[PDB]
Amino acid sequence: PLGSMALKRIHKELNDLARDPPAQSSAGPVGDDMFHWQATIMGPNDSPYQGGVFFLTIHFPTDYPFKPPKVAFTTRIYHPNINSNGSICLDILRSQWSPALTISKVLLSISSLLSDPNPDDPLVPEIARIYKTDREKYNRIAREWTQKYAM
Amino acid sequence: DDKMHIFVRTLTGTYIPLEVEPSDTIENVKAKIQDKEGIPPDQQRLIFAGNQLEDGRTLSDYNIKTGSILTLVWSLR
Amino acid sequence: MHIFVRTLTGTYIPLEVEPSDTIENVKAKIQDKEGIPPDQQRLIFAGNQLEDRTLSDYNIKTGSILTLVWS
């Protein structure tokens, strides 16, 4: 059966996202592989990323949803939990992933991470340092990066 | 039982799942598309990896595997 | 070839283009299909913003899907 067990779930999630999208994010395959999706997230209003559209790539494992998907940013973003390669630290993407967790919930968690970053347990130590020591500087830099790369 | 499950993306936004074999011809896939969605085979144009899938050739000839998405164009009608 | 432009709402716009076409007259091609002026559209392919290079250098082929952002 190869990975059809995962493809059933992936198609069901795509149908669910298409019928009722959150209107602040989108997701779906734009290429030739059902395992590879593109997603878009609108920057939250309560964050310096307001007005930016951030693109993400989703790579589904062959045994989805037993293993979590590989979600990575493709638009450059200034955030202490997202590195220059787009990797995201969410604690539900490799360590506490459980079935019945949907891609939509992952997008909502990423949006929440954008709204309220995590200084401790960082992925980029320098951005976390600037975030902890100067909030105005962090917000200005994040706004500049959002205007440059997500607008 | 080594059948591969592929998808056909239409311009309406839907994705039609098809359980096929690598040796299935492109016209066989078009017949399945007609059965599931009603579009006549002679008005279907299938695109995969930037190639127009010609009749008589098989899915394996285009490296179509499990989870492949083929774009369907409903033209000439 | 034939390319497809998807908006974030899910709607599809098919265009008949060639690899020699640059992306600003493609932007103008999107202009007279649903009404979006070129000054308020962003074209994204494979997650990268496209600046008005030609379709050949971005490796856009038949069936390629490009995301349209109202900005």
State the smallest CA–CA distance between residue A99 and chain B in angstroms: 20
Interface check B51 vs A, CB under 8 A: no
Instruction: State the burial class of residue A100 (Cβ atoms within 10 Å of its Cβ: 0-12, 13-18, 19+).
Output: exposed
Find the domain containing A103 and state its range.
4-149
Long-range contacts (CB closer than 8 Å, 24 or more residues apart) made by A50-56: A50/A146, A51/A146, A51/A150, A51/A151, A52/A146, A52/A147, A52/A149, A52/A150, A52/A151, A53/A150, A53/A151, A53/C42, A53/C69, A53/C71, A54/A114, A54/A150, A55/C44, A55/C47, A55/C67, A56/A86, A56/A110, A56/C47
How do strand B69-74 and strand B4-9 relate by DSSP bridges?
parallel
- Which chain A residue lies closest to B6 (C-alpha atoms)? A34
Question: Any idea what the Cα angle at residue A62 is, between residues B31 and C62, rounded to 5°?
Answer: 45
Please tell me the experimental approach by which this structure was elucidated.
Answer: X-ray
Residues B53, B61: contact at Cβ < 8 Å? no
Instruction: Answer yes or no: do A53 and C10 touch at CB < 8 A.
Output: no
Known catalytic residues of A? 89
Interface check A29 vs B, CB under 8 A: yes
How many structural domains comprise chain B? 1
Question: Could you tell me the end-to-end alpha-carbon distance of chain A, in angstroms, rounded to an integer?
Answer: 43
Buried-exposed string C36-57: b where 16+ CB fall within 10 A, e elsewhere: beeeebebbbbbebbeeebbee
In sequence order, the 6+-apart residues with CB closer than 8 A to the CB of A132 are A119
With CA atoms as reference, report the closest residue to B75 among B48, B51, B40: B40
Q: Which chains touch C (3 or more CB pairs under 8 A)?
A: A, B
How do strand A70-73 and strand A53-59 relate by DSSP bridges?
antiparallel
| Bridge partner residues of B8 (DSSP) | B16, B70
How many structural domains comprise chain A? 1
Q: How many CB atoms lie within 10 A of CB A65?
A: 20
CA atoms within 13 A on the CB side of C60: 32
- Compute the distance between CA of residue A120 and CA of residue A123 in angstroms, rounded to an integer: 9
Question: What SS3 state is found at C48?
Answer: strand
In sequence order, the 6+-apart residues with CB closer than 8 A to the CB of A8 are none
Q: Which two tokens stand for residue A75?
A: 């638009």
State the smallest CA–CA distance between residue A42 and chain B in angstroms: 22
Interface check C62 vs A, CB under 8 A: no
CA distances from C59 to A88, A132, C25 (A): 28, 42, 17
Q: Which chains touch B (3 or more CB pairs under 8 A)?
A: A, C
Resolution in A, one decimal? 3.0
Residues C27, C43: contact at Cβ < 8 Å? yes
State the smallest CA–CA distance between residue A30 and chain C in angstroms: 6
Interface check A75 vs C, CB under 8 A: yes
Find the domain containing B39 and state its range.
20-74
Residues A68, A92: contact at Cβ < 8 Å? yes
CATH of residue A51's domain is 3.10.110.10
**Which residue of B71, B74, B75 is the best one to mutate when testing the C interface, meaning the one whose CB has the most C CBs within 10 A?**
B71
Q: In what order do the strands lie in the sheet with A53-59?
A: A25-28, A36-42, A53-59, A70-73
**Which residue of A34, A37, A38, A62 is the best one to mutate when testing the B interface, meaning the one whose CB has the most B CBs within 10 A?**
A34
Interface check B12 vs A, CB under 8 A: no
Residue B44 belongs to some domain of the structure: yes
With CA atoms as reference, report the closest residue to A17 among A7, A27, A30: A27
Interface check C20 vs A, CB under 8 A: no
CATH of residue B34's domain is 3.10.20.90
C-facing residues of B in 11-50 (CB < 8 A) are 11-13, 47-50
